C-alpha cells in the first residue's frame, strides 16, 4: 500500500528509535562520596514492592464490582497483566530510561489505581458497559431456548452444516475441503444475513431480496428531518 520512504524517520540525536533516553544538555553525571557534602534525591529501592502491591490493589479493588462473575474476573486478569507486562515486552529499553524506568511506571500505575479505588477509571466503566451488552445477548438466547425456539446462531450453524455437505458431495476429483473454501461459504452467508437484519426476509426471496425497497423512499410524516432543511 504505502510505506514511509524517509530512511531517517526513526533517527534521534540519541540514536535509532531511542525513546528511552532522549539527548538533553543536563545529562546525568556521577557522584563521589569523598567530595559530596549533601544531596537531594528522590530515587529509592521501593519500586519493586510497590509494583507488587499495586497489582494486588488494582486486581482486588476492581473485583468488588464484578458481582462474582467468574468469567469476567479471569478476563480482567488477562487484561490487567497486559498493562503490567508493558515494560517487559516493549521495544523500548525500559532498563535504560533516563532517571529510572521502574519508578516511572510504578508512579504511573498508582495514578490508575487512585481512579480505580473510586470506581471512576474508564477501563472499569468500559467493562461494565461491555459485560451488560454481552449478558443481555446471552439472556436473549437463553429465553429463546427455554421456549424450545431455535436461536439465530443455531440456525446459521445448521444452515452452514448442510451447505458443506452439498459442496463436498460434488467435490470428488479433489478431496481437500480446505479452510479457505469453508470460510468463503460462511462469509457469503454472513453478508446475506447481515443485510437481512436491516431488511428482513418476508418471502422465498430471502433476506434483502426485494428490489422495491431501493425505489425512491421518503421520511415518514411523524419523523421528518430533525437537523436540517429538506428543500
Amino acid at each position: 500500500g504505502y510505506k514511509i520512504r524517509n530512511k531517517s524517520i526513526f533517527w534521534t540525536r540519541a540514536g535509532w528509535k531511542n525513546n528511552w533516553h532522549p539527548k538533553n544538555f543536563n545529562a546525568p553525571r556521577p557522584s563521589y562520596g569523598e567530595f559530596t557534602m549533601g544531596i537531594r534525591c528522590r530515587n529509592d529501592h521501593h519500586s519493586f514492592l510497590r509494583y507488587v502491591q499495586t497489582y494486588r490493589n488494582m486486581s482486588r479493588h476492581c473485583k468488588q464490582y464484578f458481582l462474582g462473575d467468574k468469567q469476567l474476573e479471569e478476563t480482567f486478569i488477562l487484561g490487567l497483566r497486559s498493562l503490567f507486562l508493558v515494560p517487559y515486552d516493549s521495544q523500548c529499553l525500559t532498563d535504560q530510561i533516563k532517571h529510572g524506568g521502574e519508578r516511572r511506571f510504578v508512579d504511573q500505575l498508582d495514578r490508575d489505581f487512585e481512579l480505580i479505588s473510586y470506581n471512576t477509571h474508564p477501563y472499569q466503566l468500559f467493562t461494565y458497559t461491555v459485560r451488560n451488552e454481552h449478558l443481555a445477548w446471552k439472556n436473549e438466547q437463553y429465553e429463546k431456548i427455554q421456549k424450545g425456539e431455535k436461536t439465530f446462531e443455531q440456525e446459521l450453524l445448521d444452515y452452514l452444516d448442510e451447505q458443506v455437505l452439498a459442496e463436498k458431495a460434488k467435490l470428488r476429483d479433489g478431496q481437500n475441503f480446505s479452510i479457505e473454501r469453508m470460510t468463503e461459504i460462511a462469509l457469503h452467508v454472513f453478508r446475506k444475513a447481515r443485510a437481512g437484519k436491516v431488511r428482513p426476509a418476508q418471502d422465498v426471496r430471502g433476506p434483502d431480496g426485494n428490489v422495491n425497497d431501493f425505489l425512491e423512499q421518503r421520511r415518514p410524516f411523524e419523523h421528518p428531518n430533525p437537523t436540517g432543511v429538506t428543500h
Binding site: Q71, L78, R191, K192, A195, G206, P207, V211
Partner: protein
C-alpha cells in the same frame, strides 16, 4: 426460516444508479452520522494482534459448549506436560513417536 438463494448476493449489491446532466455540484465532505449507534459490529482494533493468552482462553469457552470440546479441555489442562497453554507445533517429535507406539499392534 427463509434463506433465499445461496448463489445470489444481497440486493444492495445488485441495485445501481446512473448519472445525467445536469449534475449536482455539491461534493460530500463527510459521511452522515446522525445517531451514535454501531451495535453488533466488532472493533477494528482487533486486526493484526499476534497469538496470545486470549486465544486459548476463548477456545476453551467455545469448546466447553460441546460435549467433545469439554473432553478436550479437561484432558489438555490435566494430562499434557506443557509450561504454557499457547501450544505451538514446530516439530513432529510428539506426533511421530505417538504413532510408532500405536502402529506396533
Amino acid at each position: 426460516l427463509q434463506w433465499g438463494s445461496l448463489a445470489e448476493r444481497p440486493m444492495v449489491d445488485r441495485v445501481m444508479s446512473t448519472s445525467t446532466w445536469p449534475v449536482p455540484y455539491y461534493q460530500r465532505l463527510f459521511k452522515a452520522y446522525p445517531i451514535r449507534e454501531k451495535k453488533d459490529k466488532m472493533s477494528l482494533l482487533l486486526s493484526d494482534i499476534d497469538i496470545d493468552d486470549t486465544n486459548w482462553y476463548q477456545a476453551k469457552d467455545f469448546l466447553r459448549g460441546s460435549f467433545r470440546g469439554r473432553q478436550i479441555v479437561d484432558y489438555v489442562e490435566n494430562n499434557i506436560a506443557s509450561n504454557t497453554y499457547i501450544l505451538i507445533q514446530q516439530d513432529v517429535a510428539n506426533m511421530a513417536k505417538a504413532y510408532v507406539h500405536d502402529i506396533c499392534g
